């Protein structure tokens, strides 16, 4: 791709997300999602192989279905309210349709069925964009419609997303599919606390984006798309094994790391509202996420899988890859739990 065209297309993705964030009109929300999808489709087809075309086709179909259901929810809102303000909805049917449409845009279960395939079919930078930047706009729309969101619907979507994102990654050896099922589980965690305290939703979103950006930046720096190719990191760059160790122990919710902070604050705010069983089932289900995280750490850092002879040639060459913000994203995804009351800036 022409780098001028790449810069304009990434600015168009960011512009669509900004138009969803800053606008007060439902048509501009829909325009922003259309702009976002239309611009992100060539980011997925950057390499032009049949897997990227398949992934972009599946992504187009799911996001197009979600966009049309979103416009139907907007149209039923215009029926029962005669206006266009992006605020609470004035019909539970429009609320159900918009919650389904935003669940399809997030890839929350049971609409999760595109996320591992589409994440597998695309490169690691485009997968990073899909799993971090594309979560910002539908969570903003869910942040603005939460007086109208059905409780049972969003909690069913949340627990089904946590359970399916837990049992999905336990069978996987591809790193992109592991990050995709981790995306499903963490979006369940984010929407589970939304009607209770959406500041903790924003906290979980920011900490998840930092940790996912750390993991995809490590995967781009090591050029590893499978577990077994990530295993050969110790014989090439031994510091990267330490970094994937501390980041995967972070994403599993282990203290004293910063990935403990979101789920601890979510359990902390949901038990204020007299819900004990639901965050306990969420917390027990997150052990599956930590299980395949521990599987990755055993395969990469805590053991040494046997390498090949051609690694000796790569010993003689350093990394020329622009590892942008990788030390900053590694430190902020591990050592932020002493700064847990920093969450008040998101209020």
């Amino acid at each position: 791709m022409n780098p001028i065209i790449l810069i304009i297309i990434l600015m168009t993705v960011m512009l669509g997300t900004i138009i969803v964030m800053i606008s007060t009109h439902w048509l501009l929300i829909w325009i922003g999602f259309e702009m976002n999808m239309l611009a992100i489709i060539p980011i997925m087809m950057k390499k032009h192989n049949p897997r990227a075309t398949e992934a972009s086709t599946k992504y187009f179909l799911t996001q197009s279905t979600a966009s049309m259901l979103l416009m139907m929810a907007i149209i039923i809102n215009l029926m029962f309210s005669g206006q266009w303000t992006v605020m609470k909805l004035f019909n539970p049917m429009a609320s159900m349709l918009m919650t389904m449409a935003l669940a399809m845009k997030l890839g929350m279960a049971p609409f999760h069925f595109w996320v591992p395939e589409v994440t597998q079919g695309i490169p690691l930078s485009s997968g990073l964009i899909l799993l971090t930047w594309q979560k910002l706009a539908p969570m903003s729309v869910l942040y603005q419609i939460l007086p109208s969101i059905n409780l049972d619907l969003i909690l069913t979507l949340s627990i089904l997303s946590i359970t399916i994102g837990g049992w999905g990654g336990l069978n996987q050896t591809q790193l992109r599919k592991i990050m995709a099922y981790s995306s499903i589980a963490h979006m369940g965690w984010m929407t589970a606390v939304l009607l209770y305290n959406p500041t903790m939703t924003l906290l979980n979103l920011i900490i998840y984006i930092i940790m996912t950006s750390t993991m995809f930046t490590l995967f781009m720096a090591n050029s590893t798309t499978t577990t077994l190719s990530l295993s050969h990191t110790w014989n090439k760059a031994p510091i990267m094994t330490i970094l994937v160790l501390i980041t995967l122990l972070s994403m599993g919710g282990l203290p004293p790391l910063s990935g403990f902070m979101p789920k601890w604050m979510i359990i902390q705010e949901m038990t204020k509202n007299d819900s004990i069983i639901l965050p306990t089932l969420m917390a027990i289900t997150a052990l599956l996420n930590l299980y395949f995280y521990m599987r990755l750490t055993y395969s990469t850092a805590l053991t040494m899988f046997p390498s090949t002879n051609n690694m000796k040639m790569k010993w003689q060459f350093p990394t020329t890859k622009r590892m942008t913000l990788l030390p900053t994203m590694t430190v902020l995804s591990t050592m932020l739990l002493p700064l847990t009351p920093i969450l008040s800036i998101l209020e």
Partner: protein, 105 residues
């Protein structure tokens, strides 16, 4: 993440298409202009939680302005009783509901 950039910069990007009572071209009134103005001027500043209960009557009048469901239900009742009285023979339509009276203006 409702970053209210429009109110921060003072620019108007989409507040004009948002409601029916906004400044329309050639001052065209909407069919529920008064009802939406009453519901908005009721519900302004008191938040959603107080607006769902303290502005329920203006909201009901505005919803029944938009959808006209109570009006159509009333017309269904009147038309059904009228057709029943035509079927029972106890009613004849007047000359001004038959087309034989050469209308007013």
């Amino acid at each position: 993440p409702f970053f209210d950039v429009q109110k921060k910069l003072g620019v108007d990007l989409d507040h004009w298409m948002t409601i029916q009572s906004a400044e329309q071209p050639h001052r065209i009134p909407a069919r529920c202009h008064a009802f939406e103005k009453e519901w908005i001027e009721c519900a302004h500043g008191i938040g959603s939680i107080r607006a769902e209960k303290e502005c329920k009557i203006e909201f009901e009048d505005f919803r029944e302005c938009l959808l006209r469901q109570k009006t159509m239900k009333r017309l269904n009742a009147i038309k059904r009783q009228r057709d029943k009285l035509i079927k029972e023979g106890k009613y004849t339509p007047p000359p001004h509901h038959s087309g034989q009276e050469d209308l007013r203006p």
